[PDB]
Write a protein that binds this ligand. Sequence first.
Ligand SMILES: *[C@@H]1O[C@H](CO)[C@@H](O[C@@H]2O[C@H](CO)[C@@H](O[C@@H]3O[C@H](CO[C@H]4O[C@H](CO)[C@@H](O)[C@H](O[C@H]5O[C@H](CO)[C@@H](O)[C@H](O)[C@@H]5O)[C@@H]4O)[C@@H](O)[C@H](O[C@H]4O[C@H](CO)[C@@H](O)[C@H](O)[C@@H]4O[C@H]4O[C@H](CO)[C@@H](O)[C@H](O)[C@@H]4O)[C@@H]3O)[C@H](O)[C@H]2NC(C)=O)[C@H](O)[C@H]1NC(C)=O
Ligand SMILES: *[C@@H]1O[C@H](CO)[C@@H](O[C@@H]2O[C@H](CO)[C@@H](O[C@@H]3O[C@H](CO)[C@@H](O)[C@H](O)[C@@H]3O)[C@H](O)[C@H]2NC(C)=O)[C@H](O)[C@H]1NC(C)=O
Ligand SMILES: *[C@@H]1O[C@H](CO)[C@@H](O[C@@H]2O[C@H](CO)[C@@H](O[C@@H]3O[C@H](CO)[C@@H](O)[C@H](O)[C@@H]3O)[C@H](O)[C@H]2NC(C)=O)[C@H](O)[C@H]1NC(C)=O
Ligand SMILES: *[C@@H]1O[C@H](CO)[C@@H](O[C@@H]2O[C@H](CO)[C@@H](O[C@@H]3O[C@H](CO)[C@@H](O)[C@H](O)[C@@H]3O)[C@H](O)[C@H]2NC(C)=O)[C@H](O)[C@H]1NC(C)=O
Ligand SMILES: *[C@@H]1O[C@H](CO)[C@@H](O[C@@H]2O[C@H](CO)[C@@H](O[C@@H]3O[C@H](CO)[C@@H](O)[C@H](O)[C@@H]3O)[C@H](O)[C@H]2NC(C)=O)[C@H](O)[C@H]1NC(C)=O
Ligand SMILES: *[C@@H]1O[C@H](CO)[C@@H](O[C@@H]2O[C@H](CO)[C@@H](O[C@@H]3O[C@H](CO)[C@@H](O)[C@H](O)[C@@H]3O)[C@H](O)[C@H]2NC(C)=O)[C@H](O)[C@H]1NC(C)=O
Ligand SMILES: *[C@@H]1O[C@H](CO)[C@@H](O[C@@H]2O[C@H](CO)[C@@H](O[C@@H]3O[C@H](CO)[C@@H](O)[C@H](O)[C@@H]3O)[C@H](O)[C@H]2NC(C)=O)[C@H](O)[C@H]1NC(C)=O
Ligand SMILES: *[C@@H]1O[C@H](CO)[C@@H](O[C@@H]2O[C@H](CO)[C@@H](O)[C@H](O)[C@H]2NC(C)=O)[C@H](O)[C@H]1NC(C)=O
Ligand SMILES: *[C@@H]1O[C@H](CO)[C@@H](O[C@@H]2O[C@H](CO)[C@@H](O)[C@H](O)[C@H]2NC(C)=O)[C@H](O)[C@H]1NC(C)=O
Ligand SMILES: *[C@@H]1O[C@H](CO)[C@@H](O[C@@H]2O[C@H](CO)[C@@H](O)[C@H](O)[C@H]2NC(C)=O)[C@H](O)[C@H]1NC(C)=O
Ligand SMILES: *[C@@H]1O[C@H](CO)[C@@H](O[C@@H]2O[C@H](CO)[C@@H](O)[C@H](O)[C@H]2NC(C)=O)[C@H](O)[C@H]1NC(C)=O
Ligand SMILES: *[C@@H]1O[C@H](CO)[C@@H](O[C@@H]2O[C@H](CO)[C@@H](O)[C@H](O)[C@H]2NC(C)=O)[C@H](O)[C@H]1NC(C)=O
Ligand SMILES: *[C@@H]1O[C@H](CO)[C@@H](O[C@@H]2O[C@H](CO)[C@@H](O)[C@H](O)[C@H]2NC(C)=O)[C@H](O)[C@H]1NC(C)=O
Ligand SMILES: *[C@@H]1O[C@H](CO)[C@@H](O[C@@H]2O[C@H](CO)[C@@H](O)[C@H](O)[C@H]2NC(C)=O)[C@H](O)[C@H]1NC(C)=O
Ligand SMILES: *[C@@H]1O[C@H](CO)[C@@H](O[C@@H]2O[C@H](CO)[C@@H](O)[C@H](O)[C@H]2NC(C)=O)[C@H](O)[C@H]1NC(C)=O
Ligand SMILES: *[C@@H]1O[C@H](CO)[C@@H](O[C@@H]2O[C@H](CO)[C@@H](O)[C@H](O)[C@H]2NC(C)=O)[C@H](O)[C@H]1NC(C)=O
Ligand SMILES: *[C@@H]1O[C@H](CO)[C@@H](O[C@@H]2O[C@H](CO)[C@@H](O)[C@H](O)[C@H]2NC(C)=O)[C@H](O)[C@H]1NC(C)=O
Ligand SMILES: *[C@@H]1O[C@H](CO)[C@@H](O)[C@H](O)[C@H]1NC(C)=O
Ligand SMILES: *[C@@H]1O[C@H](CO)[C@@H](O)[C@H](O)[C@H]1NC(C)=O
Ligand SMILES: *[C@@H]1O[C@H](CO)[C@@H](O)[C@H](O)[C@H]1NC(C)=O
Lengths: 438, 53, 132, 132, 132
Amino acid sequence: NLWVTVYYGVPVWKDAETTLFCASDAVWATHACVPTDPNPQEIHLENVTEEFNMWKNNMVEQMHTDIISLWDQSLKPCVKLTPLCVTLQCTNVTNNITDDMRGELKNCSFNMTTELRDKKQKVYSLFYRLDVVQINNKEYRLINCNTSAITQACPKVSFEPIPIHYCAPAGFAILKCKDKKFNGTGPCPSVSTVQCTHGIKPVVSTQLLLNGSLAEEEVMIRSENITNNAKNILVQFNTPVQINCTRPNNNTRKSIRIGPGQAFYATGDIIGDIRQAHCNVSKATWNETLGKVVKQLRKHFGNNTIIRFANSSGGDLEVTTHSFNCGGEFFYCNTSGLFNSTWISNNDSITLPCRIKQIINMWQRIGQAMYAPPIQGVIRCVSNITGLILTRDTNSTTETFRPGGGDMRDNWRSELYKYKVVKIEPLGVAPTRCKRRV
Amino acid sequence: EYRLINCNTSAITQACPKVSFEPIPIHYCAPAGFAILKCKDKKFNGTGPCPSV
Amino acid sequence: VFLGFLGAAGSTMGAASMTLTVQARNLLSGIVQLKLTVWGIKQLQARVLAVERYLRDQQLLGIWGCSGKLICCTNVPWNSSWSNRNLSEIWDNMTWLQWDKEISNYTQIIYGLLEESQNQQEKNEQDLLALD
Amino acid sequence: VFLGFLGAAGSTMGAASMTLTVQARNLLSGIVQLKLTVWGIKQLQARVLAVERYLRDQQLLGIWGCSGKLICCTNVPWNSSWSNRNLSEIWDNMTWLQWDKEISNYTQIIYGLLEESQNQQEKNEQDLLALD
Amino acid sequence: VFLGFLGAAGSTMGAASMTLTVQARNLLSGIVQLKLTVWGIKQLQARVLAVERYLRDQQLLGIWGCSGKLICCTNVPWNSSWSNRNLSEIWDNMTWLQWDKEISNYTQIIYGLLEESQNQQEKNEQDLLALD
Ligand SMILES: *[C@@H]1O[C@H](CO)[C@@H](O[C@@H]2O[C@H](CO)[C@@H](O[C@@H]3O[C@H](CO[C@H]4O[C@H](CO)[C@@H](O)[C@H](O[C@H]5O[C@H](CO)[C@@H](O)[C@H](O)[C@@H]5O)[C@@H]4O)[C@@H](O)[C@H](O[C@H]4O[C@H](CO)[C@@H](O)[C@H](O)[C@@H]4O[C@H]4O[C@H](CO)[C@@H](O)[C@H](O)[C@@H]4O)[C@@H]3O)[C@H](O)[C@H]2NC(C)=O)[C@H](O)[C@H]1NC(C)=O
Ligand SMILES: *[C@@H]1O[C@H](CO)[C@@H](O[C@@H]2O[C@H](CO)[C@@H](O[C@@H]3O[C@H](CO)[C@@H](O)[C@H](O)[C@@H]3O)[C@H](O)[C@H]2NC(C)=O)[C@H](O)[C@H]1NC(C)=O
Ligand SMILES: *[C@@H]1O[C@H](CO)[C@@H](O[C@@H]2O[C@H](CO)[C@@H](O[C@@H]3O[C@H](CO)[C@@H](O)[C@H](O)[C@@H]3O)[C@H](O)[C@H]2NC(C)=O)[C@H](O)[C@H]1NC(C)=O
Ligand SMILES: *[C@@H]1O[C@H](CO)[C@@H](O[C@@H]2O[C@H](CO)[C@@H](O[C@@H]3O[C@H](CO)[C@@H](O)[C@H](O)[C@@H]3O)[C@H](O)[C@H]2NC(C)=O)[C@H](O)[C@H]1NC(C)=O
Ligand SMILES: *[C@@H]1O[C@H](CO)[C@@H](O[C@@H]2O[C@H](CO)[C@@H](O[C@@H]3O[C@H](CO)[C@@H](O)[C@H](O)[C@@H]3O)[C@H](O)[C@H]2NC(C)=O)[C@H](O)[C@H]1NC(C)=O
Ligand SMILES: *[C@@H]1O[C@H](CO)[C@@H](O[C@@H]2O[C@H](CO)[C@@H](O[C@@H]3O[C@H](CO)[C@@H](O)[C@H](O)[C@@H]3O)[C@H](O)[C@H]2NC(C)=O)[C@H](O)[C@H]1NC(C)=O
Ligand SMILES: *[C@@H]1O[C@H](CO)[C@@H](O[C@@H]2O[C@H](CO)[C@@H](O[C@@H]3O[C@H](CO)[C@@H](O)[C@H](O)[C@@H]3O)[C@H](O)[C@H]2NC(C)=O)[C@H](O)[C@H]1NC(C)=O
Ligand SMILES: *[C@@H]1O[C@H](CO)[C@@H](O[C@@H]2O[C@H](CO)[C@@H](O)[C@H](O)[C@H]2NC(C)=O)[C@H](O)[C@H]1NC(C)=O
Ligand SMILES: *[C@@H]1O[C@H](CO)[C@@H](O[C@@H]2O[C@H](CO)[C@@H](O)[C@H](O)[C@H]2NC(C)=O)[C@H](O)[C@H]1NC(C)=O
Ligand SMILES: *[C@@H]1O[C@H](CO)[C@@H](O[C@@H]2O[C@H](CO)[C@@H](O)[C@H](O)[C@H]2NC(C)=O)[C@H](O)[C@H]1NC(C)=O
Ligand SMILES: *[C@@H]1O[C@H](CO)[C@@H](O[C@@H]2O[C@H](CO)[C@@H](O)[C@H](O)[C@H]2NC(C)=O)[C@H](O)[C@H]1NC(C)=O
Ligand SMILES: *[C@@H]1O[C@H](CO)[C@@H](O[C@@H]2O[C@H](CO)[C@@H](O)[C@H](O)[C@H]2NC(C)=O)[C@H](O)[C@H]1NC(C)=O
Ligand SMILES: *[C@@H]1O[C@H](CO)[C@@H](O[C@@H]2O[C@H](CO)[C@@H](O)[C@H](O)[C@H]2NC(C)=O)[C@H](O)[C@H]1NC(C)=O
Ligand SMILES: *[C@@H]1O[C@H](CO)[C@@H](O[C@@H]2O[C@H](CO)[C@@H](O)[C@H](O)[C@H]2NC(C)=O)[C@H](O)[C@H]1NC(C)=O
Ligand SMILES: *[C@@H]1O[C@H](CO)[C@@H](O[C@@H]2O[C@H](CO)[C@@H](O)[C@H](O)[C@H]2NC(C)=O)[C@H](O)[C@H]1NC(C)=O
Ligand SMILES: *[C@@H]1O[C@H](CO)[C@@H](O[C@@H]2O[C@H](CO)[C@@H](O)[C@H](O)[C@H]2NC(C)=O)[C@H](O)[C@H]1NC(C)=O
Ligand SMILES: *[C@@H]1O[C@H](CO)[C@@H](O[C@@H]2O[C@H](CO)[C@@H](O)[C@H](O)[C@H]2NC(C)=O)[C@H](O)[C@H]1NC(C)=O
Ligand SMILES: *[C@@H]1O[C@H](CO)[C@@H](O)[C@H](O)[C@H]1NC(C)=O
Ligand SMILES: *[C@@H]1O[C@H](CO)[C@@H](O)[C@H](O)[C@H]1NC(C)=O
Ligand SMILES: *[C@@H]1O[C@H](CO)[C@@H](O)[C@H](O)[C@H]1NC(C)=O
């Protein structure tokens, strides 16, 4: 007869959420974080299979709110720009006649309170017409002042995305499938496990995904519900698509001592190649990759349907255009130049017009706003487009797709789908032929 | 015309009239597993072996 | 042969029992190594939860007179209603995950007798053997 | 019969010993399950103090060679000065609370020999039995 | 004779072994007893680190089938390459600090066999003695 035998160290686990913590090397917000191991360990697990589900992966939720928390903490100790909310006296800026630049900035002046709380000083600064609005030269207002206060980001702190690793506490395991195929959820024939995750950069962007990871095999299409056009579609590329964006303005920073003590960085003068900031895209590369994407689409909609690509529905600029950070500066680009195509039934280069804003609102959050300091000198950078955030638009053939975003949990999820966290249960029992003596 | 010297560098805060600045003897302790070692050697160069620990 | 953490997870319960310690070590792990700040109380909380997580079950093994754990026998007989399979149908043809899939239904029920029967009776008895 | 947490508190020490485990479990309990905030570091502090509170005495039982606790014997004889009563006057006619009322006077004194005597001598001895 | 915490630190390893418990007690110590504030999370952190510091190694002694610690034997033979000295050259003529000075070189190496060999083999074996 068999008896109850007690076992400990049993290799079993249940899907469970706990509090994850970071790790990264030894700028943005990361210093108070445990350095990574010089030899991150892993182990493929043979005969071990189980389901993943990226759409209920609470790792995303934590990461999201943690990044937000970091953001706020990095701003509290910086200078508040409360006394900037004043009536502005502004005029057009006579760019090289006649007018290709459309101005876009105003030579605003105003009676400003200085360190000598008492006698004020008439000063001036160049502002983008996206930041200011006419009251009622003419009178203008900082747009934020009708919604909330605004804080100047410190000139020392940066916004450069840094690779972050996530680790689980003892008793919890980081599981990672290596299956090159994945529908977004279901069993994985090839499952491994790791100490911690790979370095993920906290890149904030809409519409286009930047500097992410690459997919293997073919282009990956992932969606909570492909047939439901109330949902959206994640597209992961196989090959990095280069994009090179430039701001050809060697401008200065007429910092103004609007104390007491604390200093404000206003916009000095704009000189150099007065052209609109824009992005350069390899056209043939875009066409080629887009095609590869359409192949996938064909595979989930039929071998006799029509695929069209267009821009967004419009509205809030933050959603309408492609937003991203380069070197502290915030760009808004008209991606109509990319998302304008079509496919049937079965250099060259592209220039994307961009705009610059200085007053921005993070993560759709209202109640506060952050002032970007102007960055001195010409700003230009390059990155890898590694995926798309697409939405699905008389429904028997032609379908139209367009870029979206808004919810930045989407961005974190586009990477964390490779991971899941489980809770180990060391204690188990089993029937064994054994009668225990004294 | 004169100016408070601090105003060109930063803001300034008034120390509370109740709080004092009198130095008070503080003792330091280590958590369990750690030991506080103390040489009693009247001689010491600033570093090196102590015959009497 | 050293396999690695959970290296035997994809094997039969008999096979897996070979290397329970390789797992045991990292069940508590250890090491790891402007105030507050994000992570400031998260590494705190997590590292705490690890300790609790561990001891909560370790104490049960303390109560279930074994202590010298990973494996130990009892004097509680196995009730046939708790998944009636043969040893070769169990130990030589089933993983631990597959095992739990079934037996998990009677977890607290089995714990009842483990928490008690023997622990109660093994003692008293001894106290009586100490009479002389 | 399951009585409940401290269910035997109002009985003789002999009777109470029947169900020490029912209490033992909840001596550490476990489970439980804008930053800071009131309670934010209080649940923290309390849950910590529980762990320390437990182990501080558990280690003593570790030192006092038993480990398999709730009950164990020693090789230290009882000094008659420590409340000279008969077994029936003690075990069959006194609660644990009433017991402490008296014996608490010699707590550290008794701990001295428990902390030592046997722990010292049981060993060495064994080391010597291992000679052959 | 009570010496005090680390009172035998300046003696031979043989002599020092007499009073290991006097040290053992304070390895975890216990007791100790506007928000945040300096010290507010430092006493916190420190007291935590003490608990972890302790258990991290205590678990190893749990794995190394002894538990009844301070001293216990194994079934692992000593490799002569690990500082080849005689017992009188070691135990009767060397402090623990001096000992570590040398043997520390093979710490993890020795731990390998302690973590395993016996722990693996002592068991199975027993399981087989339980056949009848
Ligand atoms: C997708 O990923 C890619 C790949 O990671 C990203 O591409 C990177 O983008 C970052 C910006 O986000 C670029 O960083 C820049 O690097 C510049 C080059 O510096 C190197 O060359 C210089 C010139 O000789 C050397 O002196 C440097 O050496 C030193 O620094 C390193 C690192 O600290 C040390 O390890 C060395 O020991 C040296 O000390 C480098 O080798 C760099 O100049 C530039 O820094 C300026 O600009 C930043 C703000 O961006 C200022 O904070 C900083 O003060 C610098 O400004 C000074 O210099 C400029 C020069 O003109 C002056 O104009 C200023 O007045 C001031 O004096 C910055 O760090 C990086 O080049 C780039 N990498 C690649 C692969 O191209 C993409 O960003 C990413 N995409 C997205 C969407 O983010
Ligand atoms: C801050 O800049 C504002 C303009 O942005 C200056 O406003 C000027 O303020 C004075 C006082 O209110 C006005 O002067 C008065 O005007 C009336 C009519 O012209 C005249 O009757 C009075 O004798 C007196 O001069 C002035 O008109 C007004 N300017 C405008 C454009 O409205 C203000 O002076 C600035 N402060 C600093 C310190 O320079
Ligand atoms: C933007 O508005 C600012 C005022 O807010 C204008 O500032 C003016 O800038 C010029 C060039 O720096 C200054 O002119 C120089 O002044 C000195 C002394 O008067 C003179 O020696 C030089 O020959 C030259 O004229 C001017 O004084 C300054 N004004 C003030 C109030 O400081 C700037 O012109 C505006 N830009 C646009 C396009 O209107
Ligand atoms: C993927 O999501 C889509 C939409 O979010 C789900 O589509 C829903 O499918 C059901 C079954 O075809 C439709 O229900 C039927 O609707 C008609 C009219 O309302 C009603 O007469 C029937 O009694 C029945 O409820 C539902 O309307 C349709 N929703 C929409 C937006 O078209 C689909 O079920 C989702 N798939 C997954 C696995 O959940
Ligand atoms: C992963 O699962 C596979 C089955 O899907 C397990 O395969 C087993 O692997 C071992 C090693 O290759 C085979 O054992 C060898 O078999 C031969 C003939 O029976 C015998 O001569 C050797 O002494 C040895 O036992 C075993 O037959 C093979 N099983 C089958 C179905 O092919 C593997 O064990 C699994 N790994 C885990 C960790 O459980
Ligand atoms: C609470 O204290 C009361 C006394 O104040 C304890 O009463 C005892 O209760 C038990 C159960 O009813 C009685 O035991 C039974 O007695 C009869 C005759 O002696 C015997 O035939 C049965 O086998 C059984 O032992 C006991 O006599 C009674 N004591 C007295 C003084 O009446 C009760 O045990 C206390 N509870 C706690 C948890 O200690
Ligand atoms: C500190 O180190 C000193 C040596 O530097 C140790 O000295 C030893 O002290 C004991 C006690 O005074 C001596 O033991 C006695 O020796 C006599 C003759 O051998 C014997 O008749 C007694 O039964 C007893 O053993 C010992 O000889 C002396 N050693 C020497 C070199 O003089 C002392 O033990 C050290 N303390 C620590 C804690 O290790
Ligand atoms: C600043 O220049 C802009 C053109 O760059 C002028 O814009 C005109 O503004 C009025 C009022 O909104 C409209 O009636 C005109 O149709 C606008 N013109 C165009 C080209 O859109 C504005 O008048 C200029 N201000 C100054 C003082 O001359
Ligand atoms: C706060 O100011 C904003 C502009 O900075 C106002 O926004 C306008 O809101 C109405 C209603 O949604 C729209 O018709 C306008 O087009 C918005 N303007 C822009 C710039 O987007 C908003 O009305 C202001 N609130 C207060 C109470 O006046
Ligand atoms: C993930 O793949 C699974 C199959 O592995 C898909 O499951 C199908 O789901 C629909 C909706 O519940 C059912 O009609 C099918 O019968 C399911 N298939 C099977 C095999 O059960 C699911 O659609 C996939 N998701 C993605 C986004 O493609
Ligand atoms: C763009 O992504 C490509 C991967 O497709 C990256 O390629 C790496 O490029 C460097 C420089 O040539 C090589 O050292 C690496 O070995 C390349 N990787 C591979 C996979 O071939 C490139 O680094 C990416 N750029 C950005 C800015 O991240
Ligand atoms: C669409 O038609 C293509 C052929 O034009 C089909 O392609 C097959 O796809 C599967 C999956 O990749 C392969 O197993 C076959 O070998 C492919 N055939 C050939 C000719 O390459 C695909 O099956 C078609 N889809 C529909 C729904 O019928
Ligand atoms: C959408 O892109 C197409 C090219 O893919 C653009 O087509 C141009 O359309 C105009 C109007 O019919 C013609 O004058 C051009 O000759 C067309 N170009 C070519 C390549 O045929 C169209 O302009 C684009 N729309 C957007 C808003 O940019
Ligand atoms: C801030 O004010 C201080 C005086 O309160 C200025 O200090 C002078 O600095 C120069 C350069 O080091 C020295 O020549 C003077 O002797 C300093 N004065 C004294 C009182 O030490 C400093 O220049 C001021 N900064 C600003 C921007 O004006
Ligand atoms: C094994 O445990 C089962 C419950 O898991 C016990 O089942 C009882 O069996 C008897 C006989 O069929 C019935 O009278 C009871 O009603 C059953 N209980 C329930 C919960 O269904 C069985 O008694 C147990 N065997 C041992 C020896 O205790
Ligand atoms: C029992 O412990 C008591 C102290 O609790 C010891 O009492 C000593 O007894 C002798 C004889 O009466 C006196 O010389 C001492 O002065 C007493 N000590 C004190 C503290 O009063 C007694 O020795 C102990 N018995 C055992 C066997 O050790
Ligand atoms: C004792 O351990 C040493 C290593 O610390 C072992 O040394 C090996 O000895 C043999 C014979 O000289 C050599 O072939 C090996 O290359 C040595 N290893 C190294 C690391 O140098 C020795 O085998 C061990 N003895 C026991 C019984 O295991
Ligand atoms: C138990 O296994 C034997 C063979 O060893 C088999 O005859 C019997 O069917 C097995 N049990 C079950 C419930 O079938
Ligand atoms: C011990 O009990 C006996 C009866 O069992 C009694 O004669 C004696 O008085 C008791 N002890 C005390 C101190 O009285
Ligand atoms: C071991 O000690 C003996 C004396 O007991 C000695 O003869 C021999 O030299 C010692 N070992 C070493 C390595 O010398």
